[PDB]
Nucleic acid binder design. Structure first.
Lengths: 206, 95, 78, 60, 125, 149
RNA sequence: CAACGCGAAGAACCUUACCAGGUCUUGACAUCCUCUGACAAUCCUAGAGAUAGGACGUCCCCUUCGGGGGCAGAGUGACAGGUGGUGCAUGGUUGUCGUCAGCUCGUGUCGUGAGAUGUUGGGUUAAGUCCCGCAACGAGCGCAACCCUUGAUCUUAGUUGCCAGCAUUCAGUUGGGCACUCUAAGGUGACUGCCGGUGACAAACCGGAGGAAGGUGGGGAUGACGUCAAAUCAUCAUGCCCCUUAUGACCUGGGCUACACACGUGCUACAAUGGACAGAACAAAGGGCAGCGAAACCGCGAGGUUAAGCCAAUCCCACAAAUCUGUUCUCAGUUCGGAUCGCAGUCUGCAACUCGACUGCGUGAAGCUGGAAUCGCUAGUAAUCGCGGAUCAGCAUGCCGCG
RNA sequence: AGGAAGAC
């Protein structure tokens, strides 16, 4: 009884996939293994706040590129992450891996980082309203064309669970050539479990 | 010799088609145009909800398509050159 | 068991055959509803698991083609 | 109790007809797809995320 | 050797009419045991009689796909294309007479939750 | 809302006999056509030399004798559910006439289809008809209750 | 309404949670302490389950001879597990009103205030869609368009299609060629683009023309703020409850499929707009390698045999029925209808009794178009006729899709 | 100026 997920509605027609390959008659166990890579990358790089990973097959070699938007607390001495990730990933999948990193300039317009920012202030236990206003101000001072933010759950009141919305600019969810970046994040506090949905209208596609 | 290629993304398969035609033409390999082969379809139907409301369903399309090229003359040095030529990771070449 | 004969639990098959080739003995304890009654099993006493107990049944001569399973119905009605 | 039957799923069974299918990314039987080994729930969630590159919205 | 195309209801047909003595044939099998359903007979006899070009051209017809009445509509569109190709001097008279519509009436896509893409199953309070 | 009608033409405008062209090629479809129409044509022949004249005018006065002029609808006024007679548009007249013809022909019941269809054609040809009597039932209700206007 | 062919796109045993029986305590499931550093399989006794002992029967790699690379096991506590309760403790999803056209904000006016205005009024639209007055001027989510598919054509692209134009044969397979259907990229295209009449000349409405379609061409996807404390603790997760010598575990058998009844949804009919038999037919869209399986042979039948071809526009499913011509039945519980019942089988599977499907027989039931009421349906729509597909070893009248 | 119709 809600809107259909906009990234899942945009993929295939305007949005290119995050995976660019084919597997025949071994499709199932490649999906199982590369989701094991994606959960392991998420679990060990949640501190480094990856926006997205994207993979490809190189005829029994796999190429991984990871979008993290900062080298600073991520690359270490420069080779530490690539040795500690490439040997570990070789140990897990048993196949030849290659890894590369990419950065996002104007780094406050990426939705997964925005929802992780909101979630991080929720375990930081600053007030949710201050989190919404500060993130709205951060996204407009970075510059954008529209932001809609939602946080639902038990927001400090024990006996009621209600959502809060905060928006600015235009976010049409029904124009197809619109390039909404959408993100859902999950926050665990002593009050309970809180859901964040942020979706950003960055630009236009002709 | 016939070369097939089958994948999901008809854009990058099209630029792969003129790139292989360009390499074969600059090698002078008695070129033939890439013939469009019919697609293959699989439409899956998923319960929209989790526990209830059987009349609420959604459909998910999978479409994958193939094209074919043919080389008449042998030309083995240029054939080995286009074997050793690099390909993108979506073009999904079959010999 | 449609073309190649009755399909049974061979361990207690050979147990009851080594019973009856020597003597006549007490009831045969079985959990197995699986078995078809072989024609050489005439006159024996079988304790079949009904789900709650092991009901006793005597085997008559007329046990022509049907399996052992119908001796203990598993439902009680009125 | 789910991971007891998950242990049944990864362990080979006694007889080969006793073997059944479970999607094993999320935790259920009952409408697993064979050619993905994902059921409806975790299939549609991870498809809206965007993996399984053949799959998109369907209309004709 | 004028050549026309016709499409109606998931079926195609191609027609070739050359100057003959007025012979009409589909698939090189003749009218009696090849053509039932006399709607096809009025199909094959209407436009040549309404025009003055009846006994001049002979027509070979090739057929692919579909059923009988949709096949007849494909015959209609094929011979209409063949005449507008051959003799365009009264093609405008054929236009406002009609028969050039090429109806888009094809089978409807079945809708989920519905039986025949219009029929909801049944309702009760 | 509003009514709207379309245009469509089956037959040719000129050199086209209306009833003969209808009789050979028009408005009976969806199978069981061929043998039924041949035995129906020879039913027309046996009634042709059963009557002592041309049979088309007695078929057309059969159509007149089945063809209704008025019918009556029910309108809600008061506590009685009164009835209002009405003048009828010609397409509705044709639809009603053919509809009563076919459903009472299939409804009375007889040996088989061609002789029963001819049976109610001749039953409409003479004035003493069953569905004809129903047409005069529609009138005798209409000019029994046309004091309502 | 918005539960009742619903979660289930598939219960013989696992699925399975529920019941009975016999069995477990760091347990198969995650990590630390210490050894052996590689573990297991084959046949018995019970075996149905753990267990207990037996025949080869705890068997890698780096190695400055110290030790490590986590796979296998062994003893230990921190432990792990809960398809157990709480949807009124929650996120995450979904239906509903409803594709209904509405829901609000900024600035500013009016009001002591709650509030109002914009968002009302006139003309049209499917629309809060457009335009003219107006203390309002604007903006945002919605509507419409952009997206996909079906509707005609140009260029390029002709095999695993097309046989037009040709020579060839019962297999028109072939030697030769892309113009057509066909597969498909760029497009061409329909947008109020012209005439007349209304409409204060505006927006719009009606009738006309090359056109494949004229007034969003047909359909899909798309579902605003919110309501129903609507549904789900059955994917995951602090909140309490019992356990951890047990609501947590292992397996065997049973039950989820019972049955005096009442209901929801469907199938098959009650028939001569037919039944039976015989002959000629027209061919959409999907699936195929622990597979799809052609030909031929055997079989009063589902099927069996060795098996050519196919990793697929070639091979198989794929033998489409309703349709069209002949004989019969002549109005009947019948040559309708096929359900229950016995016999004998085929296939799958360790196993078809509880509880699979299908076939050959024989048996032939109720039923002669159904009261109160009640359901769906507007340019292939209802109705019929089939055809695929999905979960799956096997099981359609269920569901999805196609003609 | 054109029907009597209860309760939650």
């Amino acid at each position: 009884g809600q809107k259909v997920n906009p990234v899942g509605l945009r993929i295939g027609v305007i949005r290119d996939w995050e995976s660019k390959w084919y597997a025949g008659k071994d499709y199932a166990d490649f999906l199982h293994e590369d989701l094991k890579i994606r959960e392991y990358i998420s679990k060990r790089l949640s501190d480094a706040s990856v926006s997205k990973v994207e993979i490809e097959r190189a005829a029994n070699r796999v190429n991984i590129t990871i979008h993290t938007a900062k080298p600073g607390m991520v690359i270490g001495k420069g080779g530490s992450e690539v040795e500690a990730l490439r040997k570990a990933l070789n140990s897990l999948t048993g196949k030849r891996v290659h890894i590369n990193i990419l950065e996002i300039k104007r780094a406050d317009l990426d939705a997964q980082l925005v929802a992780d920012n909101i979630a991080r202030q929720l375990e930081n236990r600053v007030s949710f309203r201050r989190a919404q206003k500060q993130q709205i101000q951060r996204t407009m001072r970075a510059g954008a064309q529209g932001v809609k933010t939602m946080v639902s759950g038990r927001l400090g009141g024990a006996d009621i669970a209600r959502s809060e919305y905060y928006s600015e600019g235009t976010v049409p969810l029904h124009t197809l050539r619109a390039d909404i970046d959408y993100a859902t994040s999950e926050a665990d506090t002593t009050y309970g479990k809180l859901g964040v949905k942020v979706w950003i209208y960055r630009g236009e596609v002709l | 010799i016939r070369i097939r290629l089958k994948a999901y993304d008809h854009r990058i398969l099209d630029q792969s088609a003129e790139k292989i035609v360009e390499t074969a033409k600059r090698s002078g390999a008695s070129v033939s145009g890439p013939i469009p082969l019919p697609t293959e379809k699989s439409v899956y139907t998923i319960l929209r909800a989790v526990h209830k409301y059987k009349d609420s369903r959604e459909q998910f399309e999978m479409r994958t398509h193939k094209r074919l090229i043919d080389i008449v003359n042998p030309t083995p040095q240029t054939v080995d050159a286009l074997m050793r030529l690099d390909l993108p990771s979506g073009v999904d070449i079959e010999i | 068991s449609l073309k190649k004969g009755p399909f049974v639990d061979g361990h207690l098959m050979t147990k009851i055959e080594k019973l009856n080739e020597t003597d006549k003995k007490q009831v045969v304890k079985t959990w197995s509803r699986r078995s078809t009654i072989f024609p050489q099993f005439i006159g024996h006493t079988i304790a079949v698991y009904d789900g709650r107990k092991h009901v006793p049944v005597f085997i008559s001569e007329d046990m022509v083609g049907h399996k052992l399973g119908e001796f203990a119905p598993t439902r009680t009605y009125k | 109790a789910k991971k007891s039957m998950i242990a049944k799923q990864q362990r080979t069974p006694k007889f080969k007809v006793q073997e059944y299918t479970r999607c094993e990314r999320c935790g259920r039987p009952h409408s697993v797809i064979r050619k993905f080994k994902l059921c409806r729930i975790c299939f549609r969630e991870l498809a809206y995320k965007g993996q399984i590159p053949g799959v998109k919205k369907a209309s004709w | 050797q004028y050549y026309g195309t016709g499409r109606r209801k998931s079926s195609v047909a191609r027609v070739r009419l050359v100057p003959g003595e007025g012979r009409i044939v589909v698939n090189n099998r003749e009218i009696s045991e090849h053509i039932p359903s006399a709607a096809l007979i009025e199909d094959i006899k209407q436009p040549l009689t309404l025009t003055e070009t009846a006994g001049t051209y002979d027509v070979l017809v090739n057929v692919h796909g579909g059923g009988l009445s949709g096949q007849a509509g494909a015959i209609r569109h094929g011979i209409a294309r063949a005449l507008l190709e051959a003799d365009p001097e009264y093609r405008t008279t054929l236009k406002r007479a009609g028969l050039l519509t090429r109806d888009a009436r094809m089978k409807e896509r079945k809708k989920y939750g519905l039986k025949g893409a219009r029929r909801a199953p049944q309702f009760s309070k | 809302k509003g009514p709207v009608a379309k245009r469509d033409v089956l037959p040719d405008p000129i050199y086209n006999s209306k009833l003969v062209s209808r009789l050979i090629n028009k408005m009976m479809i969806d199978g069981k056509k061929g043998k039924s129409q041949t035995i129906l044509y020879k039913s027309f022949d046996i009634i042709k030399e059963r009557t002592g004249n041309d049979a088309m005018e007695v078929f057309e006065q059969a159509l007149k004798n089945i063809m209704p002029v008025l019918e009556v609808k029910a309108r809600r006024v008061g506590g009685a559910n009164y009835q209002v007679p009405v003048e009828v548009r010609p397409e509705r007249r044709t639809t009603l006439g053919l509809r009563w013809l076919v459903n009472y022909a299939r409804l009375r019941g007889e040996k088989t289809m061609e002789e029963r269809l001819a049976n109610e054609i001749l039953d409409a040809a003479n004035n003493t008809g069953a569905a004809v009597k129903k047409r005069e039932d529609t009138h005798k209700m209409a000019e029994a209750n046309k004091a309502f206007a």
